[PDB]
Design a protein around this ligand. Structure first.
Ligand SMILES: O=C(NCc1ccc(F)cc1)c1ccn(C(F)F)n1
Length: 149
């Protein structure tokens, strides 16, 4: 799979993260990210995707070593961690054709797994609108503990 790059943007209290909601197959909430272009450096792709999806330019805030990277079904997703962005920042995607909405969420309220269906004796997981964000939540909480505490 082509690698994806983007950001986990936090506010000043470190309580809240910025998620984006797409359409169709991307109908739930997730961190802003997207696929790297040929010859494009990871930091430039993260900034490009984030600015296209949120209207906020992270370029001057990216730290090279501050990211969480996951490989999910043999596709690598790397989100640069961007703390301290004010909650009253006005975010606006470049294309309403791809982004429905942009919101801050409480980190402590976000799920870090989907729920099973063990009350129904059925296999699998119940739908969850935070599906794409979920894999990053525990690693983010662990990263924030180590970095700040
Ligand atoms: O990435 C997803 N959603 C967030 C997003 C939307 C638009 C973007 F441009 C960037 C991120 C996604 C993929 C599959 N699903 C599923 F849960 F519906 N969500």
């Amino acid at each position: 799979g082509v690698p994806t790059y983007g950001a986990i943007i936090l506010d000043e209290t470190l309580e809240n993260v910025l998620l984006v909601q797409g359409y169709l197959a991307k109908s739930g909430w997730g961190f802003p990210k997207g696929k790297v272009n040929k010859e494009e450096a990871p930091h430039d792709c993260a900034a490009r995707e984030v600015f296209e999806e949120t209207g906020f330019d992270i370029k001057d805030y990216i730290c090279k070593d501050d990211y969480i990277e996951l490989r999910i079904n043999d596709q690598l997703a790397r989100l640069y961690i961007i703390p301290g962005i004010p909650k009253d920042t006005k975010f606006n995607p470049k294309t309403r054709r791809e982004i429905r909405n942009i919101e801050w969420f409480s980190i402590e309220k976000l799920p870090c797994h989907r729920n099973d269906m063990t009350p129904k004796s059925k296999l699998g997981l119940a739908p969850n609108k935070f599906f794409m964000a979920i894999p990053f939540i525990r690693p983010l909480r662990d990263w924030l503990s180590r970095r700040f505490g």
